Ligand binder design. Structure first.
Ligand SMILES: *[C@@H]1O[C@H](CO)[C@@H](O)[C@H](O)[C@H]1NC(C)=O
Ligand SMILES: *[C@@H]1O[C@H](CO)[C@@H](O)[C@H](O)[C@H]1NC(C)=O
Lengths: 156, 441, 49, 49
């Protein structure tokens, strides 16, 4: 038997997004699945003009619109920002490319650099206290002037 | 000559290699997978379809009481309703006003439509994995022959012996129990034979399409005929086949992970790119040519002209190739950060040749093996503008394909900054310790 | 756009430019039949109405 | 049928027998049938002999 063929969707592409404008004559079935380990399948009965915004990854997506043959799409690495340029541009590029291994990355390269900074600063404070406390404890001394500088020391 | 390797299970993406044999010039090998079928071993359990309540003619006993007789029939119900005064066009079917009996009998049968539409319940456990492979080696053209992916069955593709398989991952989209309806396959935990409830699914179960057991539980209950009417009323739960048909959610043809396409003669899942496939080809010795009769390429210098990390062949490079003699010569990039489009280049005595390649790196630094000698190509690549494409990627990312020189320099400066600060702290501690010790002692 | 409003726009009621974007795609005729099948997005004027 | 869900109409009693507690089976994955004998042979795969 002859079955209806729904009007073709109008397809617009955004970064990692497929925007389909669907104009059915009759209630039409729209099914999508991602071509990776998790299908994330979506099944929908579209009866009214509708815009749908499926997220396409690099692994792929496959969408069937009505009795049309299934159509497979893949998203390229076409995100926004300027690698090779200023640090803020680098962050926005890697946030568009990888949303949740930059947040983690920044957060664990910033907490880590902070932790290292405070430990090394504490160690430097301790060595300073140790360097100066003897000379402090001798109100009279000639001061090892180069050391008088290298720590803060108010010489004789 | 034997050549072992491992290639991804992706369909359509050619695996390329350079088979090098000591004493002979390399031969270019190209193995591509046209399709890969995971073909389970099924076992038909039963077939379900709509029922037809066959209602034979009622037995009307004029001045008598005729009584029930159980028959070996699916959901057979016989009732003996008494005190019936049937009227039909002649008018007065039995004389006796009240001592009249009608025997109403009904039994469910397989519908006429069971031979065309029905649901087949299957238990699948594990079958073979079959594939069609295209191979080329040297000047031999495409061969396109069919193989079993078990790792032990040779396939004579032209004049080469291919021992493909086994698949690294034993994943199969089908669960233990499946239901086939038309061209759709469902992962339905169907009820066992003789268990099916009244109206959900498997209310009518037949082992085969021509069986005679035909278990059927549809709650047939004969009702009392209407005054004066000879007929056989009955009440039944509506067919669970149709309830299933309008309540079945989604076939395995759509849900199925990895892009399995489910075909149904035989039941198989095709072209799902999961895991990797070992391969072992045996190229004939006629393909190989002695290393002396092949050109020597020297003074190789590669420059990447415009490049972009698109999914298609978004890179062009040119190599200056001052050579000894003229002829065809293979080219390959083994690093795995670039995939070269062309297999061979024709070389004159000197000049330059251009080759296309695909890559995912911002900076593709890859070694190209021309003939015997090798040249390193490095350059910079721009993002592709197109967001969504209609073809799979021809390359593979590696978790370093995006870092780029600036961000590398940043991770350097950061890591080095922490390291230097901590190492300066530890060196400061050592210096204080030494200065105190020399004070005291 | 094709089907929201102003899919068919004419400067006047008697103009000849008649911009019209309605995603007209012709389909292959059925086997053995002389006809001109086509597919189109339904009018955005009535969707607006 | 010993599955624990399939009734069997024995005379006028309904028996739902099974399932067997142990899933043990004498046969290994690969067997060879010759006449009336059965062997647990790890037979070579097709094309390997
Ligand atoms: C889809 O995206 C378009 C444009 O970004 C927007 O106009 C529309 O509201 C979105 N719809 C949904 C359901 O997200
Ligand atoms: C690969 O084999 C197919 C048939 O399976 C054949 O049509 C095709 O020509 C081969 N590949 C190329 C590049 O020719």
């Amino acid at each position: 038997c002859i079955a209806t063929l729904a009007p073709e969707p109008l397809v617009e592409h955004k970064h990692r997004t497929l925007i389909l404008h669907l104009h059915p004559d009759h209630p039409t079935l729209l099914t999508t699945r991602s071509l990776g380990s998790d299908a994330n399948p979506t099944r929908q009965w579209i009866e009214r003009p509708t815009t749908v915004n499926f997220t396409v990854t690099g692994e792929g997506l496959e969408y069937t619109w009505g009795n049309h043959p299934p159509k497979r799409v893949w998203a390229q690495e076409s995100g926004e920002g300027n690698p090779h340029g200023w640090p803020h541009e680098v962050v926005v590029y890697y946030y568009n490319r990888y949303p949740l291994t930059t947040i983690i990355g920044l957060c664990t390269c910033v907490a880590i650099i902070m932790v290292s900074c405070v430990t090394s600063v504490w160690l430097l404070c301790r060595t300073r206290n140790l360097c100066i406390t003897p000379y402090k404890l001798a109100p009279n001394a000639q001061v090892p002037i180069l050391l008088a500088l290298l720590c803060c020391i108010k010489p004789t | 000559y034997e050549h072992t390797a491992v290639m991804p299970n992706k369909v359509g993406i050619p695996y390329k290699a350079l088979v090098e044999r000591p004493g002979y010039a390399p031969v270019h090998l190209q193995i591509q997978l046209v399709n890969t079928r995971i073909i389970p071993s099924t076992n038909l359990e039963y077939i379900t379809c709509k029922y037809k309540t066959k209602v034979p003619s009622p037995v009307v006993k004029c001045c008598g009481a005729t009584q029930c007789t159980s028959k070996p029939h699916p959901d057979y119900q016989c009732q003996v309703f008494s005190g019936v005064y049937p009227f039909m066009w002649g008018g007065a079917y039995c004389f006796c006003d009240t001592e009249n009996t009608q025997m109403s009998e009904a039994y469910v049968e397989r519908s006429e439509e069971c031979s065309i539409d029905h649901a087949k319940a299957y238990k699948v456990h594990t079958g073979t994995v079959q594939a069609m492979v295209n191979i080329t080696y040297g000047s031999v053209s495409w061969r396109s022959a069919d193989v079993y992916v078990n790792g032990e069955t040779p396939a004579k593709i032209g004049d080469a012996k291919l021992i493909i398989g086994p698949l690294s991952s034993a994943w199969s989209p089908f669960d233990n129990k499946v239901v086939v309806y038309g061209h759709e396959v469902y992962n339905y935990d169907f009820p066992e034979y003789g268990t099916g409830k009244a109206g959900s699914f498997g209310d009518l179960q037949s082992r085969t399409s021509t069986s005679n057991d035909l278990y059927a539980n549809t709650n047939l209950k004969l009702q009392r005929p209407q005054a004066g009417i000879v007929h056989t009323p009955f009440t039944q739960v509506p067919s669970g086949f149709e309830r299933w048909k309008k309540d079945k959610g989604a076939p395995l043809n759509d849900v199925a992970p990895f892009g399995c396409s489910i075909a149904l003669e035989p039941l198989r899942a095709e072209n799902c790119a999961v895991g990797s496939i070992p391969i072992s080809i045996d190229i004939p010795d006629a393909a190989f040519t002695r290393i002396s009769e092949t050109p020597t390429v020297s003074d190789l210098e590669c420059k990447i002209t415009e490049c972009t990390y698109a999914f298609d062949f978004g890179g062009i490079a040119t190599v200056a190739y001052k050579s000894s003699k003229a002829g065809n010569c293979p080219i390959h990039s083994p690093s795995g950060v670039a995939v070269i489009k062309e297999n061979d280049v024709t070389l004159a005595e000197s000049g330059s040749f251009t080759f296309h390649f695909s890559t995912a790196n911002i900076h593709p630094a890859f070694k190209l093996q021309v003939c015997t000698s090798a040249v390193t190509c490095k350059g910079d690549c721009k993002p592709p503008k197109d967001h969504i494409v209609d073809y799979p990627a021809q390359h593979t990312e590696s978790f370093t394909s995006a870092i780029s020189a600036t961000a590398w320099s940043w991770i350097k400066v950061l890591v080095g900054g922490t390291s230097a600060f901590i190492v300066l702290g530890l060196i400061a501690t050592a210096v204080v310790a030494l200065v105190l010790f020399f004070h005291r002692h």
